[PDB]
Design a protein around this ligand. Structure first.
Ligand SMILES: NC(=O)C1=CN([C@@H]2O[C@H](COP(=O)(O)OP(=O)(O)OC[C@H]3O[C@@H](n4cnc5c(N)ncnc54)[C@H](OP(=O)(O)O)[C@@H]3O)[C@@H](O)[C@H]2O)C=CC1
Ligand SMILES: O=C(O)Cn1cc(Cc2nc3c(F)c(F)cc(F)c3s2)c2ccccc21
Length: 316
């Protein structure tokens, strides 16, 4: 297994990256520096995570130390929902570039298909708790994303949390210039996504699996919720291979030809999570892990379910 997957712009994307959602600003600089030292080359960022400046400090130090060159890193960020209007997309990208202290991004994603009212709040709500939409549609935001490629700010563009009809809408866009390179979606043994992943891969779109460990630090976790890291069936597969449960959960998507982006701020775990290139799950193990699907989705907010472009009413 090769460590990088070819995208439809001819660039190679590392199949393992470091996630940064919920990584506190006081701890994420060290986390990214340790990750680069132990071999990570792909970092997944977003403006809404409120820590891009601190991620940028780490990247800049390791470029200055000559640990890595810029061309070896693969830096991803995402356009938040309050910037879907075509005249706001460039300025949102440039704020992220300014915080990360970079002159281009390797990949820039539409974070969610839903546009929200522009303003200071990331989740503008009405008096009854519903998100306030904007009158934007995904095709005009896509055309604004394409302009960032032509201006040299980003090397590739893609999408996140799009269902297959929303992907189809972009693929059928009048005058489509650049196809989405990536769809970043939730994927783990309790939400295996078979139909959407085969949809995407058949279309030449690479899939990145987010929350591969089930996001145990998500703020809305409840004590009664399932835990992938503690599932005794997954523990038994790990023990057979003399690996940890997290290492099996990271290797699983890699063998489906997915990119995977586990988050940690703990140095030991950052190093553990990288040590996944020296074993293989058997075909039988893969089919068994797929059988654990329960259509259990952890990233989906009730306040967004009446939005016209909410992605998760459709089957896939
Ligand atoms: N596009 C989108 O809408 C979304 C994108 N994402 C991206 O995907 C990334 C990963 O998903 P995320 O939801 O953060 O959750 P993960 O599934 O990656 O789980 C992160 C949690 O697992 C813990 N952990 C990490 N490694 C280990 C290990 N070896 N052993 C035990 N526990 C471990 C972490 O603890 P600790 O940090 O304390 O070590 C943290 O509590 C995000 O950070 C973000 O970059 C996620 C959700 C949505
Ligand atoms: O987004 C991240 O990366 C991490 N991340 C994930 C969620 C849950 C969402 N669920 C939805 C949703 F169903 C929508 F339709 C639109 C939307 F914008 C959200 S956001 C979230 C909520 C607050 C901050 C980060 C969050």
């Amino acid at each position: 297994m090769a460590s990088r997957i070819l995208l439809n712009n001819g660039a190679k994307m590392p199949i393992l990256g470091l996630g940064t959602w919920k990584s506190p600003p006081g701890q994420v600089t060290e986390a990214v520096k340790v990750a680069i030292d132990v071999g990570y080359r792909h970092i997944d960022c977003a403006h809404v995570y409120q820590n891009e400046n601190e991620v940028g400090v780490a990247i800049q130090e390791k470029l200055r130390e000559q640990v890595v060159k810029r061309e070896e890193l693969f830096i991803v960020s995402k356009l938040w929902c309050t910037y879907h209007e075509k005249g706001l997309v460039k300025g949102a990208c440039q704020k992220t570039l300014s915080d990360l202290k970079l002159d281009y991004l390797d990949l820039y994603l539409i974070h969610w298909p839903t546009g929200f009212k522009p303003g200071k709040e990331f989740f503008p709500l009405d008096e009854s708790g519903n998100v306030v939409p904007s009158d934007t549609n995904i095709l005009d935001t896509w055309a604004a994303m394409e302009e960032l490629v032509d201006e040299g700010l980003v090397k590739a563009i893609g999408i996140s949390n799009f269902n297959h009809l929303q992907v189809e809408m972009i693929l059928n866009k009048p005058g489509l210039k650049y196809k989405p390179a990536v769809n970043q979606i939730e994927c783990h043994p309790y939400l295996t996504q078979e139909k959407l992943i085969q949809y995407c891969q058949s279309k030449g779109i690479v899939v990145t699996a987010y929350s591969p460990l089930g996001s145990p630090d998500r703020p809305w976790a409840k004590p009664e919720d399932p835990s992938l890291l503690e599932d005794p069936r997954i523990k038994a597969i790990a023990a057979k291979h003399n690996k940890t449960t997290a290492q099996v959960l990271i290797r699983f998507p890699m063998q489906r030809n997915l990119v995977v982006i586990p988050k940690s701020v703990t140095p030991e775990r950052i190093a553990e999570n990288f040590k996944v290139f020296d074993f293989e799950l058997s075909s039988q193990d893969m089919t068994t892990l797929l059988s654990y699907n329960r259509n259990w989705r952890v990233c989906a907010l009730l306040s967004c379910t009446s939005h016209k472009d909410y992605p998760f009413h459709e089957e896939f």
